[PDB]
Ligand binder design. Sequence first.
Ligand SMILES: Cc1cn([C@H]2C[C@H](O)[C@@H](COP(=O)(O)OP(=O)(O)O)O2)c(=O)[nH]c1=O
Length: 395
Amino acid sequence: GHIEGRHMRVLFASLGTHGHTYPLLPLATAARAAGHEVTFATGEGFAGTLRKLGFEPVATGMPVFDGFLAALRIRFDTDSPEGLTPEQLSELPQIVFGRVIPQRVFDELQPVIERLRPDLVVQEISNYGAGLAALKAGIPTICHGVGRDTPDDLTRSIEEEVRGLAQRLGLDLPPGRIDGFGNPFIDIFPPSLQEPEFRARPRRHELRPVPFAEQGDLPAWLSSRDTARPLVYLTLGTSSGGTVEVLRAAIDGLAGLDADVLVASGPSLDVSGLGEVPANVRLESWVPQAALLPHVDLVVHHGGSGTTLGALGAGVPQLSFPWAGDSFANAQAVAQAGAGDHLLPDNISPDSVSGAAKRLLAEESYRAGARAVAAEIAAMPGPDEVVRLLPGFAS
Ligand SMILES: Cc1cn([C@H]2C[C@H](O)[C@@H](COP(=O)(O)OP(=O)(O)O)O2)c(=O)[nH]c1=O
């Protein structure tokens, strides 16, 4: 038992992937420092990290792969994607994140919210199941964004599946876009790069896109490299951002440069077949990306929001290979700010990557564009400032 606005029970809830869980960590940490009790619901795999942050971890949802198996069965009556055209497979995402996962998360959070009786729920934008659970339980909720607003087909499809799931759960949602379930919205995307319409949205609040501070060690070789030549960082994320074929094409393109290349392949990408690489290319399974970026001269990636905002925050030029989800939205934002460039899925090769990487390194305008947003980001309200709003949200 606590008094109003002090030592609150705040329930953070996000999808079970790094790209969706990490963005909320800074605010959760700030909430704990403010004296609130943080319970964090997400993939069980994050349990260790959450506990170390002082949070009480809760396991929800399922691995993305398992989600696509479910959708695969629901939609195509099969256990394999084999024989299915990329157009048929592109019908699955809305089922996975609009129905299958939300259903699971809703089922698991209902009893959780029941016992925890949280004063406030911080719902990750794409974690609709958590939004529905809190809605039914009548808990004051705020929507925590992970990137740029995306008013595209993919998002609308996912939202309609969410609507269908809502109906079946006895929850009648308002007509029109989900729009964070009409709750206050925490926007971590650089306002200048944010969709104009969305930036005007009422009850919207800025929050600096702080990169998760992991206490891991940087690769030791950084301490003895030729710091007179560029350091290039290559990564395709942690969830379906790109393929190993694309990673191979990027390595061949970057390896030729007079530069050091650090590659982080992540937990999902199988690189057992990647093969041989020149000595200036180092392959890592995982790196403390937040601590790394300040040392980097160029970030080459899949276009994930976390790495996009990360590069922007560090004032580093970025080359992206947009293909999945909001990767295209982020590519537009980067182009708008002249903070980097991109190559389309049919234009990925050693040559195209090499040429683009050289341009982003040689021409100052790209770094200049990145430094501009880095300043804007630094001027945004920090987690400790925004956290002072939580009591008002709960009340
Ligand atoms: C591959 C890799 C990712 N990360 C983190 C940084 C980002 O916050 C997050 C990647 O998320 P993001 O860049 O949004 O792409 P996706 O959501 O497709 O994974 O994972 C590391 O910290 N170290 C690593 O080696």
